[PDB]
Design an enzyme around this catalytic site. Sequence first.
Site, PDB file in Angstrom:
ATOM      1  N   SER A 142      26.567  44.459  38.502  1.00  0.00           N
ATOM      2  CA  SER A 142      25.927  43.222  38.393  1.00  0.00           C
ATOM      3  C   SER A 142      25.222  43.272  39.935  1.00  0.00           C
ATOM      4  O   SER A 142      26.164  43.611  41.029  1.00  0.00           O
ATOM      5  CB  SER A 142      26.661  42.066  38.070  1.00  0.00           C
ATOM      6  OG  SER A 142      25.947  40.790  38.856  1.00  0.00           O
ATOM      7  N   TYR A 155      34.278  37.502  39.931  1.00  0.00           N
ATOM      8  CA  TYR A 155      33.422  38.496  39.061  1.00  0.00           C
ATOM      9  C   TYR A 155      32.778  39.278  40.016  1.00  0.00           C
ATOM     10  O   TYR A 155      32.758  40.556  39.882  1.00  0.00           O
ATOM     11  CB  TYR A 155      32.154  37.617  38.406  1.00  0.00           C
ATOM     12  CG  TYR A 155      31.314  38.315  37.484  1.00  0.00           C
ATOM     13  CD1 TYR A 155      31.667  38.965  36.535  1.00  0.00           C
ATOM     14  CD2 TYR A 155      29.873  38.480  38.272  1.00  0.00           C
ATOM     15  CE1 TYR A 155      30.641  39.835  35.680  1.00  0.00           C
ATOM     16  CE2 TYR A 155      29.143  39.376  37.454  1.00  0.00           C
ATOM     17  CZ  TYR A 155      29.345  39.853  36.389  1.00  0.00           C
ATOM     18  OH  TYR A 155      28.438  40.588  35.553  1.00  0.00           O
TER      19      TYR A 155
END
Length: 244
Positions: A142, A155
């Site tokens: 990501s 995350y």
Amino acid sequence: IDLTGRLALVTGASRGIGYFLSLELAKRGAHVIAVARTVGGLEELDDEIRKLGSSATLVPLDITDMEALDRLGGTIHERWGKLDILVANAGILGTISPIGHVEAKTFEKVMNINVTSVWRLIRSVDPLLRASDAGRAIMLSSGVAHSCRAFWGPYAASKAAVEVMARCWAEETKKMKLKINSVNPGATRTAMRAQAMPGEDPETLPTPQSVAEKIVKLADPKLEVTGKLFDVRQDRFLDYHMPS
Ligand SMILES: [Br-]
Ligand SMILES: [Br-]
Ligand SMILES: [Br-]
Ligand SMILES: [Br-]
């Protein structure tokens, strides 16, 4: 890209990028081993795969079931004796919040699924990937792994850890036929909309299919690149840079 006779293992295969990449792999002649939590979701994927000339091997399992991951490696070895392509796509977002507001259960789950289960998978199929004449590992990440966006801490950190594991693995194997790269798929119009970049138009976010179509290039036996970050939106490999 011809993946005829190739064997691919895709985790998180029942929805999002994992779903569409399973299809793109199948379109090109690969046999897909599709891993996901629920049998129903894998069956829905399989219906689409069967519409092509293909068929898939469906493996419902708990990705945190660390012994099940070991057993999967054994199963693949006995049946095929190698693995050509690994797509490590399994992962959760957790909850957006100040780092000190995160629930412990959520933090532990983010790390266990996003980091530890990825390592467990690597350990299980690394020998199989080496048995391929052109093993290819595709590690989903990501952009927030590098942007370190406020309120995305657990995350972001988990995906940074994945990329570093992938870089170390690539360095350890760089003289072998095995190639390992990470992927920043960017935001799509469905999957990961919230991750859109500044200057990226929410009205023209890519389809997940178009994103998966670009990622499948990392499965190419002709690929020579290892240890890099493929940026789908920019459609190119990026180099990592030391802090300076
Ligand atoms: Br999964
Ligand atoms: Br996704
Ligand atoms: Br949230
Ligand atoms: Br090694």
